[PDB]
Write a protein that binds this DNA or RNA. Structure first.
Lengths: 255, 255
DNA sequence: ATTTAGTT
DNA sequence: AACTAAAT
DNA sequence: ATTTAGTT
DNA sequence: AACTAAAT
């Protein structure tokens, strides 16, 4: 039982993650940027009620904190179903435009998979849960991602912001990918025979023998857990001959 | 008085032209072409009355003749003014598509004018009237350009066609330009010092001295008249230092 | 609620 | 230029 | 009266 | 995709 031997490595039994080895991230602005404050678009009670539980959970988790900032972007009520449950989606486009660009270092899936040799037939796929939220944001950069939150009946001060790398920020995928690479560098050095592919929060470990894949997976889960990341036990594909990775179906070394 | 010394050369005093040296033109069809017969679109009495005098004049001139043909294209009532006088415009597009293409040998005005040296400052401009109609169409090709004509009160048999190169035919400008070049080849050889530019029916004669331009123009008018072409006395610009040719204003050797 | 790159 | 489709 | 290449 | 502009 992998879930039992590695309690800390799974999102199911390890609690929200936090990359303890990673220094809080500082987000540099473009040379001429000035704060932009876009008023919150009026939200219906339906959308607000649907979103509230999520905001509360994040505040309880310390991922969202009250603040007073010259920056402000609108929260969008987005429901996946035909018209069911709502979830908060922040429109950070005006913030993204004022943030200095960085080199896109995340490889496209096609090129990433090209590094998978035929020799390693035993695959293991893990996806990290709430990956961006595992990376802390430096207090100086936190104000940048502020939005307004007002509960008609006892609403928070006014604005809330993130203490972790947020969704909707143009550099999140790249910064997370680079941070995880730094954290798993040693693991790669300690396991020369293993093949590890990283695509932001989607990991593929490849070994030659079921045994290698087994021991390798134990080591990877142990490492991820200690670093503060959390993998989804529900979606985990362990030591399989066939697995689904990045939209592909890896079987017999195909795709 | 040029109009008096060259009666035959002017459209005003020489009658409709006819290039007597040019063999009637044979129009080759594309390898797979078959006759196309498009019914005449109903025409209002207003348009018909406006067009009638033109049709009658052409029939009197032998330019239009009755016929029975498997080919037929529509006549369009087109009035230049805001809604005044109508004139017949034949829609020969379906005929054009079935006629074999020929190399476009008429040079564009820009390139044509590049052959005008600074030495020849005395210009003479003539435009031939009803140029295409001066070229006969071989009896075998005449049926190709048939259209319907019916006078509510005593209408012609049915169809009429052209005995001369028609307007609206894709190869008319090129075939006329090549025919005139053949007819004026000798003139060019007999006047080495003169510069003659031809753009379909628009002619520009350039000389070094007013005298040369004078004698040259007399010779050109005499030649055109004898060949069966007719120039517009009204629009004629003779031995000028400045003239309008092909939309350009030739002055001092400029443009 | 807005933007934007595409399509029609 | 009026519509779609994506995207935050 | 229809077509067509362009624009909006 | 609804409109224009030319063209025969």
């Amino acid at each position: 039982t992998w879930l039992s031997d590695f309690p800390q490595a799974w999102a199911e039994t390890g609690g929200m993650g936090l990359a303890v080895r990673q220094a809080p991230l500082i987000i540099p602005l473009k040379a001429t940027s000035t704060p932009v404050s876009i008023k919150q678009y009026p939200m219906s009670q339906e959308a607000r009620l649907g979103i509230k539980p999520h905001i509360q959970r994040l505040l309880d988790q310390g991922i969202l904190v009250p603040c007073q900032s010259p920056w402000n972007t609108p929260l969008l009520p987005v429901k996946k179903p035909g018209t069911n449950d709502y979830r908060p989606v922040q429109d950070l486009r005006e913030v993204n435009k004022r943030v200095e660009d960085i080199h896109p270092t995340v490889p496209n899936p096609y090129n990433l998979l090209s590094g998978l040799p035929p020799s390693h037939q035993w695959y293991t796929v893990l996806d990290l849960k709430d990956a961006f939220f595992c990376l802390r944001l430096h207090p100086t950069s936190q104000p940048l991602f502020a939005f307004e939150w007002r509960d008609p009946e006892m609403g928070i001060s006014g604005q809330l912001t993130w203490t972790r790398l947020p969704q909707g920020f143009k550099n999140s995928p790249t910064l997370f990918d680079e941070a995880l690479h730094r954290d798993l560098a040693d693991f790669r050095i300690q396991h020369p025979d293993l093949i590890l592919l990283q695509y932001v929060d989607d990991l593929l470990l490849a070994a030659t023998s079921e045994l290698d894949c087994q021991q390798g997976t134990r080591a990877l889960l142990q490492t991820l857990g200690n670093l503060g990341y959390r993998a989804s036990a529900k979606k985990a594909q362990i030591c399989q001959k066939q697995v689904k990775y990045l939209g592909y179906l890896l079987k017999e070394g195909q795709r």
